[PDB]
């Protein structure tokens, strides 16, 4: 019935925009064919729609955001239930739309999203590989469109007047390239050089102008925090990573999120993490900072506010460094080798942080 | 200063043939820039040369084979030592040249080969992905040419008359695509569907017209066969796999090769494995067949000769099936689920094989 429910796109526009030659400078257009289904797969689609947009700035007007708005207005017209949404989108999401879809997925337990992309947008760019990793960890299922999916979206969203789908040359080769690229950038771990040069806890002299953040999640069963291998991650910063962890898909009740950040939070990061832990009673937050970040301003009140709201704040020592080497770094079997005076420096940093967080005088 | 030793190629030819846009139908030339060094990086090159060929049949005339012949004649003119060979080749090797380079590397303890490829030849084709895996397990180091390598072989092998190397557009994007592809096809494991449809041991009715073969190697230390995770593998067949395992690239003395083949060897495979196990006393061979292959001919005497020459020949039961599910299959965490009557069928097949191999009557 999808044909009834959509107003189809021209065969030429489909062939033009879903051609999956990986590099395609000239396509300023995104097309997003979406279908909405119930929990069980035998059921027919409740609705479907085609969205269009441009790749260039003002992302509010990107088809992903248009879908989010349309879907928000659509769910209010139907009894509340669990939905499975499938996308056939000609370009992979941008950084901002990845963030927005990830927030939406992490805060909604009743929505499942599968995204089939024809081409990866900016697969060479570390920000976008991170964007796809964020989307995947929020719970979206990222895939490359293969022959079957082009056939399906020809049949369902294109005015293929009885016409069968006829592939262009090199469709499977482009799929091979794109699916290898997506698989690797999804399974990517931190580089050893950037780990040891960003988590090094000696006084700043060089570099380190970015924040690096590893995180693990555990949940509570029988008063013992059992780990959840499936939702570890690491992020690079120049809002709030806790808005991207789906605290609902992890087996229920309560959670503890352990955080290893190369720099201690600046003021607004502390404010946002405090607001989150205050609006989400079921989550405990543990922070481990390699270094204290002095933003010349309100960082101290930020850390104190974060501490008063239940977060535990400490500095990384040997075991946290080794843990993040083993877990989040592409170590290649090589073991963690600490820099000189790591323990010394971390004890001094612990002293400054304790002075910072100290409330009552002795 | 390789330039002394080579006659450089034209800049036009270099830009034309080493352009690394992944798909390039129109280049049927291969160019192979080779440099030979001793075993340390500080040393200068002893020699270097450029080879050319065509991609299309008669592979004896492919630049890989030309290098093998030239190198064979070259080593006989120099005091024997350990060599490190580096290749800058515009296309990755074909199946046959992958086989021959792999055999050469596996038989030779004094040669180290690193192959930097600009483009992957037939990356979409399972035979060629297998070819690259064969090359890698023989000990060759496969890599994609990046900006640095194009710069290096511009400087060393091209008549860039003082001119520096100026990249074409999309060089790094193509590198990202190609190295994601190479990494994926290198780390590839067997598909679950093809595993259980090829190693299923109930009587043939459908398919199974190809042979699938997993293998692991152990070596002997302290009268206990210690495993060697790094030299496992699996191959698909329509010379002899033991000719591709480098029995010399690990703790010496002696080895045991355990082989799990979906079909028992046909006659000529048995004769070739017998010749290998006879010409290499330091290697023990264990065969596990899922099914007996009756080629209408001399398969029985083949198995019997293989047994006389020291190989141990058995049929797979639950433990071998489960082992290869765990080790060589992309199981995805999913556990091995045996088919009905697996054990029965394996006992009957073991009985037939025992009748086959039986020498003396009782
Ligand atoms: Zn966007
Ligand atoms: Zn060849």
Q: Which CATH architecture has domain A1-187?
A: 3-Layer(aba) Sandwich (3.40)
Give CATH superfamily name and number for A192-357. Cytidine Deaminase, domain 2 (3.40.140.10)
Out of B23, B123, B177, whose CB is closest to A181? B177
Query: d(Cα A344, Cα A334) in Å, to the nearest integer?
Result: 24
Query: d(Cα A20, Cα A120) in Å, to the nearest integer?
Result: 9
Secondary structure class of B338 (helix, strand, coil) = coil
Closest-CA residue of chain A to B186:
A180
C-alpha closest to that of B213 among B187, B226, B194, B228? B194
Residues 6+ apart with CB under 8 A from B183: A180, A184
Q: Positive or negative, the Cα torsion across A171, A174, A179, A180? A: positive
Resolution of the determined structure in angstroms stands at 2.8
Query: d(Cα A50, Cα A29) in Å, to the nearest integer?
Result: 13
Secondary structure class of A34 (helix, strand, coil) = strand
Structural Rg of chain A based on CA atoms: 23
Q: Using a CB-CB distance cutoff of 8 angstroms, which residues of chain B are in contact with residue A230?
A: none
Q: Positive or negative, the Cα torsion across B323, B326, B330, B332? A: positive
Helix (H) or strand (E) holding B268: helix B267-279
β-pairing verdict for B211-220 and B141-144: unpaired
β-pairing verdict for B29-38 and A312-315: unpaired
* Residues A215, A258 contacting (CB under 8 angstroms): yes
Query: d(Cα B153, Cα B89) in Å, to the nearest integer?
Result: 10
Token pair 């002299």 is at which residue? A205
Alpha helices in B165-222, H assignment, sequence order: 171-186, 192-198
Residues that constitute the known binding site of B for Zn(2+): 62, 64, 94, 97, 266, 269
Query: d(Cα A327, Cα B159) in Å, to the nearest integer?
Result: 47
Kindly state the tokens that stand for A12: 């030429």
Secondary structure class of A280 (helix, strand, coil) = coil
Fold held by B2-187: Cytidine Deaminase; domain 2 (3.40.140)
Q: Are B23 and A173 within 8 A, CB to CB?
A: yes
CA distances from A342 to A203, A210, A316, A351, B49 (A): 11, 21, 10, 14, 50
Query: d(Cα B163, Cα B165) in Å, to the nearest integer?
Result: 7
Q: After which residues is chain A broken (C to N over 2.5 A)?
A: 238
β-pairing verdict for A29-37 and A83-91: antiparallel
Q: Using a CB-CB distance cutoff of 8 angstroms, which residues of chain B are in contact with residue A184?
A: 180, 183-184
Q: After which residues is chain B broken (C to N over 2.5 A)?
A: 238
Token pair 């003395």 is at which residue? B253
Identify any residues that bridge with A216 across adjacent strands, giving them in sequence order: A258
Q: Using a CB-CB distance cutoff of 8 angstroms, which residues of chain B are in contact with residue A176?
A: 123-124, 181
Structural biology method used = X-ray
Out of A124, A172, A181, whose CB is closest to B124? A172
Task: Pick the ligand that lies closest to the CA of residue A97.
Answer: 1
Best residue of B171, B180, B189 to probe chain A, by most A CBs closer than 10 Å: B180
Q: Are A177 and B181 within 8 A, CB to CB?
A: yes
Kindly state the tokens that stand for B124: 């979409």
CA distances from A63 to A94, A155, A319, B165, B325 (A): 11, 21, 45, 41, 43
Task: Pick the ligand that lies closest to the CA of residue B67.
Answer: 2
Query: d(Cα A286, Cα A278) in Å, to the nearest integer?
Result: 14
How many CA within 13 A on the CB side of residue A228? 26
Q: Are A176 and B123 within 8 A, CB to CB?
A: yes
Token pair 């087996």 is at which residue? A251
C-alpha closest to that of A269 among A230, A232, A243? A243
* Residues B152, B207 contacting (CB under 8 angstroms): no
CA dihedral B150, B155, B157, B158 (to 10 degrees): 90
Kindly state the tokens that stand for A342: 């790591």
Q: Are A177 and B172 within 8 A, CB to CB?
A: no
Output b/e per residue, B231-247; b: 16+ Cβ within 10 A. bebbbeeeeebbbbbbb
Query: d(Cα B207, Cα A288) in Å, to the nearest integer?
Result: 57
Q: Are A180 and B176 within 8 A, CB to CB?
A: no
Output b/e per residue, B195-225; b: 16+ Cβ within 10 A. bbebbbbeeeeeebeebbbbbbbbbbeeeee
User: What are the two backbone dihedrals, phi and then psi, of residue A283, each rounded to the nearest 5 degrees?
Assistant: -120, 125
β-pairing verdict for B312-315 and B83-91: unpaired
Identify any residues that bridge with B259 across adjacent strands, giving them in sequence order: B215, B287
Closest-CA residue of chain B to A126:
B176
The Cα angle at residue A90 between residues A141 and A83, in degrees rounded to 5: 40
Helices (H) and strands (E) in chain A, counts: 12, 11
Query: d(Cα B56, Cα B248) in Å, to the nearest integer?
Result: 34
Distance from CA of B74 to the nearest CA of A (A): 36
Helices (H) and strands (E) in chain B, counts: 11, 11
Closest-CA residue of chain A to B171:
A124
User: What are the two backbone dihedrals, phi and then psi, of residue B143, each rounded to the nearest 5 degrees?
Assistant: -145, 160
CA dihedral A32, A36, A39, A42 (to 10 degrees): -100
Residues 6+ apart with CB under 8 A from B241: B213, B215, B233, B235, B259
Break chain A into its structural domains and give their ranges: 1-187, 192-357
Centre a 10 Å sphere on the Cβ of residue A100 and count the other Cβ atoms it contains: 18
Query: d(Cα B297, Cα B276) in Å, to the nearest integer?
Result: 22
Kindly state the tokens that stand for A313: 């704040």
How many CA within 13 A on the CB side of residue A362? 2
Q: What is the DSSP string of B24-60?
A: -TT--EEEEEEEEEESSSSSPPSEEEEEEEESSS-GG
C-alpha closest to that of B13 among B215, B182, B153? B153
* Residues A144, A117 contacting (CB under 8 angstroms): yes
Q: Are A181 and B183 within 8 A, CB to CB?
A: no
């Amino acid at each position: 019935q999808i044909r009834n429910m959509v107003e189809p796109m021209d065969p030429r526009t489909f062939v033009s925009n879903f051609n999956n030659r990986p590099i395609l400078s000239g396509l300023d257009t995104v097309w997003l064919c979406c279908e909405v289904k119930t929990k069980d797969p035998s059921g027919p689609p409740l609705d479907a729609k085609i969205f269009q947009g441009k790749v260039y700035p003002k992302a509010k007007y990107h088809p992903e955001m248009r879908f989010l708005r349309w879907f928000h207005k659509w769910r209010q017209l139907h009894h509340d239930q669990e939905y499975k949404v499938t996308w056939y989108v000609s370009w992979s999401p941008c950084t901002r739309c990845a963030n927005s879809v990830a927030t939406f997925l992490a805060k909604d337990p009743k929505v499942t999203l599968t995204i089939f992309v024809a081409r990866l947008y900016y697969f060479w760019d570390p920000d976008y590989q991170q964007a796809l990793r964020i989307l995947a960890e929020a719970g979206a299922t990222m895939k490359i469109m293969n022959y079957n999916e082009f056939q399906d979206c020809w049949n369902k969203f294109v005015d293929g007047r009885g016409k069968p789908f006829k592939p262009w040359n090199n469709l499977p080769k482009h799929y091979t390239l794109l699916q290898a690229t997506l698989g690797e950038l999804l399974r990517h771990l931190m580089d050893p050089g950037t780990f040891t040069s960003n988590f090094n806890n000696k006084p700043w002299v060089s570099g380190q102008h970015e924040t690096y953040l590893c995180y693990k999640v555990e949940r509570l069963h029988n008063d013992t925090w059992v780990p959840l291998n499936q939702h570890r991650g690491f992020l690079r910063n120049q809002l709030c990573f806790l808005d991207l962890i789906p605290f609902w898909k992890l087996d229920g009740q309560q959670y503890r999120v352990t955080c290893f950040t190369s720099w201690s939070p600046c003021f607004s990061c502390a404010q946002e993490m405090a607001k989150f832990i205050s609006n989400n009673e079921h989550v405990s937050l543990c922070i481990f900072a390699a270094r204290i970040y002095d933003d010349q301003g309100r960082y101290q009140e930020g850390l104190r506010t974060l501490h008063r709201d239940g977060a535990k704040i400490a500095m990384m020592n040997y075991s946290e460094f080794e843990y993040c080497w083993d877990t989040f770094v592409d170590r290649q079997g090589r073991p963690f080798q600490p820099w000189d005076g790591l323990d010394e420096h971390s004890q001094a940093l612990s002293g400054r942080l304790r002075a910072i967080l100290q409330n009552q005088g002795n």
